[PDB]
Structure 1
């Protein structure tokens, strides 16, 4: 069969691209994915990683984890109930999450039936030649051919995959993929990694752990959440600890063995040991290029294994494009979606558009959560002669009553002090992901600190902190911090 566009991976980017090509530019479109619904054995499926084993289910499970805090905090506002009756039923959470994800799976199924010129093929897509995608039974290129799809244009949109360290006993460890399908909540869990996935799952496991349970998070470096604002990294460390999570920094697993009872015996590089029920490896995600047989067409890969792309998502082979995590730039669903739209607008619209990977608002669904947009100060301080930092950090009033006095809201604005232009906004606290979205719009409009502090506050809110900062807390002058 012959298509204007064949999309390998029915994920965030691949579905946006395919749908836009078909419906907006009236192209005939094929899309390939390995599974029609969520879970084992391939985890990602129709909808992509976000829908199946990413943003969507994880946000539901963090929402669930948040009730641990709400139930406790309710008491400061006069709520009374039998604390000893309280159970976190993980099986119910997983069932609710599964129905939500399956409902999305099914609606995508329906979208493919009801959308003329948009066809779904099940199985493993790879490049036979520069105008032919072969769909096969398995990831093994010797497996049976299901389809051969003639393609004017080929979009690689296979996303990323958990990185597992080659340590002895790696097979006794899981990734985020398996974490979504644990039948029981682990009593003892080690999350390995200081990134958003380790931290978000550490919060999930901490809420649902059975009595006398314990969540440990380990990270090879000194401070979790590298890439985030340093004040936020320190505070989220403190606030995780105050909710009973053990943060082991400068620690990394050397090997894993099974204890006699089938629990995992963890030996850290430091020699230290830890017995846990689950070891969840969240140390990175790598582009999924192994199965695509890109050697058949000579698409240039980076040493990392990402598809190399120009700003317009073009590979070195004309008619073959890559978007989303496979490009190993910003691994976020809205960026993949944005890349997908910009490509189809370029290729089929002659409306040439590149995704701006700068000033992308993002969140961490930690407890409490992070919202951030633009540059952290250390980065700004190398690219700008004078940087101002406006900082507000305090326990909001409601958390003095709640009893969570450790829950400092952090609001930080980083500016080019020469003209007041906002380079970065960094939030930690309840609502931070919701606050930061319209901040993304501000930074796209080249907002200055004066545009923030001349806006009238909404009171009482956490967000009004952003519009109450007149005076820098400190500066960077030629990379050097000054009071």
Structure 2
């Protein structure tokens, strides 16, 4: 059969714009790409470029880079750099301004991409499914608003991503999320970050860097140790170093009631029954797939837990012509994962050579201060899945920190290997440059690197990374899930 478009992508995101571009350029198909708005902005935060560009990776990193100067300016003193250190506080207003300039600049380059690419058209509005071949674009999220466009397509691709989750406590509406955090007029003096995940830990670092005079940031998590699912020794050292940096880490604590005050501040009720006032309260509870308004039922597309889209290894839904990638599938919620999922989708339906995304042994990072760089299994998980595992560990304060005054900044590397093989199953790093090192570590790992391949490599001196090639003797072992000091 013959229709108007070959592909209609719902969501101009990291994955969406990858599949859209590739189909249109290398295969010269006719691709329509639907998104909510053109440039970044408060009313509906996401835009052209997805969460990555608008309210995610890109702006986050810039603000984490901005916050990192607080330490660096302090650290410079030991090396001979003298200036006014008296109540040295930063300008939040000129950070957001500069941030907006860059985000908008990327918003503009994606806009001119559509004009420069034949077959690639942008369609502003709220895309929703009608049937297996028809995507309806509406004026608002409300399914009774005006119908802007009716797109007739061979294939549909859902890349609408995810949305912040909120807790069902009274006064929920008075709290902000990562979305609102980007567009705050002023940096908060009294800041509460709720949750112990990626966003919570990262933004606690941002606010702590940009807090005004005498300000403070409280991170509160409902459990024992923050960042569940990461290397426990890394998590412990990270809690210790966030503390040393100023952030008051608060475990086994959770808000139950929030009330609005007359002066503007927020009154918060906790688990232990204590009461406190915070200028802003951010919720980093996690991200649920954004698919509750797409009407997947009307096409026969299976909706799992939290609205996730049931896909096979090749991203294909219950309907043979409809596909889904990125956060909306709830597999591995990262930008480069969604991009790979998109490029694979093109290679399959329009390329002739099908490929599935390798979701295993994927190197990711946490952009806290200091940052985490990880790839592979935790020692807890590898113990459950393997006969006998060796745990290599190394901690150090870099020589420069003896001069800088930040003697709390301990670089940590922990390698988890299969004892039988020698195969590296996990590498976990904490410290500066850790997200940069973990990248080429991940090239070794999916390549199937052994611990012998590491320490036989001649090091690069002086670097933090050279320590990867100096770990030969394991600290301890796991034997059939049991922690042992030596091998029987």
C-alpha distance in 1 between matches for 2:366 and 2:191? 20
In structure 1, the partner of 2:30 is: 28
Provide the C-alpha distance between the structure 1 equivalents of 2:89 and 2:219, rounded to a whole number of angstroms: 23
- Aligned with residue 425 of structure 1, among 419, 424, 427: 427
Deviations 1:95-137 (A, max 9, x none): 1110000000000000000000011000000001110000000
Determine the structure 2 residue equivalent to 1:296. Answer: 298
1:224 equivalent in structure 2: 226
Aligned to 1:335: 337
Q: 1:206 aligns to what?
A: 208
- Picking from 141, 150, 153, the partner of 1:148 is 150
Q: Find the residue that maps to 2:74 and give its secondary structure.
A: helix
- Paired with 1:309 and 1:295, the residues of 2 have a C-alpha distance of 15
Distance 1:355 1:251 in 2: 38
Distance 1:358 1:271 in 2: 43
Report what 2:98 is aligned to.
96
CA shift, 1:85, in A, is 6.3
The CA deviation at 1:293 is 1.1
CA distance in 2, matches of 1:24, 1:425: 37
Aligned to 1:479: 481
Q: CA deviation at 1:269?
A: 2.5
- TM-score (normalised: structure 1): 0.99
Q: Residue in 1 aligned with 2:159? A: 157
SS in 2 for 1:355: coil
Question: Match of 1:341, SS?
Answer: helix
Q: What is aligned with 1:345?
A: 347
Please state how far the C-alpha of 1:316 moved relative to its aligned partner.
0.5
- Aligned counterpart, 2:439: 437
Deviations 1:449-478 (A, max 9, x none): 000101110010000111110111111111
Q: Which runs of 5+ in 1 are unaligned?
A: none
Render the CA deviation track for 1:14-56: whole Å, top value 9, x for unaligned: 0001111111122110000001011211111000001000000
Answer yes or no: is 1:251 the counterpart of 2:244. no
Q: Which residue of structure 2 lines up, in the alignment, with residue 276 of structure 1?
A: 278
1:127 aligns with 2:119: no
Q: Which residue of 2 aligns with 1:309?
A: 311
Rounded Cα–Cα distance in structure 2 between residues aligned with 1:269 and 1:292: 37
- Segments of 5+ residues of structure 2 without an aligned counterpart are none
Give, in whole Å, the separation in 1 of the partners of 2:230 and 2:238.
11
**Alpha-carbon distance between aligned partners in 1 of 2:305 and 2:462, rounded to the nearest angstrom:** 51
Question: In the alignment, what sits opposite 2:242?
Answer: 240
TM-score w.r.t. structure 2 length? 0.98
Please report how far the alpha carbon of residue 86 of structure 1 lies from its aligned counterpart in structure 2 after TM superposition: 2.5
* Matches of 2:251 and 2:271, distance apart in 1: 12
1:137 to 135, 139, 158: 139
- Structure 1: distance between partners of 2:457 and 2:125: 53
Question: Please, which of 362, 379, 384 is the counterpart of residue 381 of structure 2?
Answer: 379
Shift of 1:255: 1.3
1:59 and 2:68 equivalent?
no
Task: List 4+ stretches of structure 1 deviating above 2 A.
Answer: none
Q: 1:361 aligns with which of 363, 368, 371?
A: 363
Cα offsets for 1:228-272 (capped at 9, x unmatched): 111110011000000111111111111110223221011012212
- Measure the CA separation in 2 of the matches of 1:205 and 1:286: 25
Residue matched to 2:183: 181
Corresponding residue of 1:3:
5
The 5 Å alignment of 1:43-122 reads 43-84=45-86, 86-122=88-124
Q: Structure 1 residue 402: deviation in Å?
A: 1.1
Tell whether the 8 Å contact from 2:87 to 2:213 is kept in structure 1 after alignment. no
| Offset at residue 378 of structure 1 (A) | 0.4
Match of 2:263 in 1: 261
- 2:16 matched residue in structure 1: 14
